Amino acid sequence: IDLTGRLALVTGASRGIGYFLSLELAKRGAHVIAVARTVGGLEELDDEIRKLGSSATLVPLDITDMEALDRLGGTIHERWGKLDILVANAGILGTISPIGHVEAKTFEKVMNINVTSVWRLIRSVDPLLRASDAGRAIMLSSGVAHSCRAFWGPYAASKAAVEVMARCWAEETKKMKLKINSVNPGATRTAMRAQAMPGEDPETLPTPQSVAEKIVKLADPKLEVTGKLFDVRQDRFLDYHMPS
């Protein structure tokens, strides 16, 4: 997959999948705009990016700072005039507990970060993605969005909302060059261990690098798929099914 001359925006870039996917994108010639909360974490990512032939644009910001997201879109437009790849990876787990035990502040934060800030980002860079000759949006989700695991309610619901926004966006744009898909990255040996599936061996959970390596396929200008869920563990696109 050749991403030479491509511009990618990765949120939650300073750790976990966001970190490793930034690297996989950079390995393939993309220029990464790396968004995260702290400058230090972005600098650590940048050290690794510089070890490749590459260099990144570091954008520390509060993902809930809704005007900062608007400004980022303006910055990208002025400098490059388009955006080729969006990786919406920013997100928090909240706290595992019965739905009625959840703290209000935690519920509101889960929804504001996991849902509203994703929508804000979409609004900000949708025009830029349309200016690409092959815009690609990659929306990070979780298997619990569909398994509806006990005690994971707010998180599960937030990720279901993200997938539905992505599906609607894909339907609205399906005749365009833009393709939008969600991703279930599965559990990794570090990131999201607790999300391992029944029948998935905790001793052989994938490296985050190997997971990021598969996700980068969704950035391919040759990709024809839109509105689907990419299951990394199964290494294939899944179809959504109506209740019946």
Active site residues: 155
Residue list 49-68, contact with Br ion (CB under 5 A): 63
Listed ranges 13-21, 75-83, 98-106, 226-234: which one lies at the site for Br ion (CB under 5 A): 13-21
| 108 forms part of the interface with Br ion (CB under 5 A) | no
Using CB under 5 A as the binding rule, whether residue 16 contacts Br ion is answered as: yes
Size of the site for Br ion (CB under 5 A): 10
Distance between CA atoms of residues 62 and 184, nearest Å: 24
Give the Cα separation of 50 and 176 in Å (integer).
Answer: 34
What are the two backbone dihedrals, phi and then psi, of residue 239, each rounded to the nearest 5 degrees? -90, 145
**Cβ pair 11, 37 in contact under 8 A:** no
Q: Which range in 17-25, 47-55, 199-207, 216-224 contacts Br ion by CB under 5 A?
A: 17-25
| Amino acid at position 110, single letter | V
- Residue 110 C-beta-side C-alpha neighbours within 13 Å: 20
Q: Do residues 200 and 152 make contact, with C-beta atoms less than 8 angstroms apart?
A: no
Stretch that binds Br ion, among 92-100, 156-164, 220-228, 229-237 (CB under 5 A): 92-100
Q: In the range 212-241, which residues lie near Br ion by CB under 5 A?
A: none
Q: How far is the CB of 138 from Br ion (least distance, A)?
A: 13
> By the criterion CB under 5 A, which residues form the site for Br ion?
11-12, 16-17, 63, 90, 95-96, 172, 191
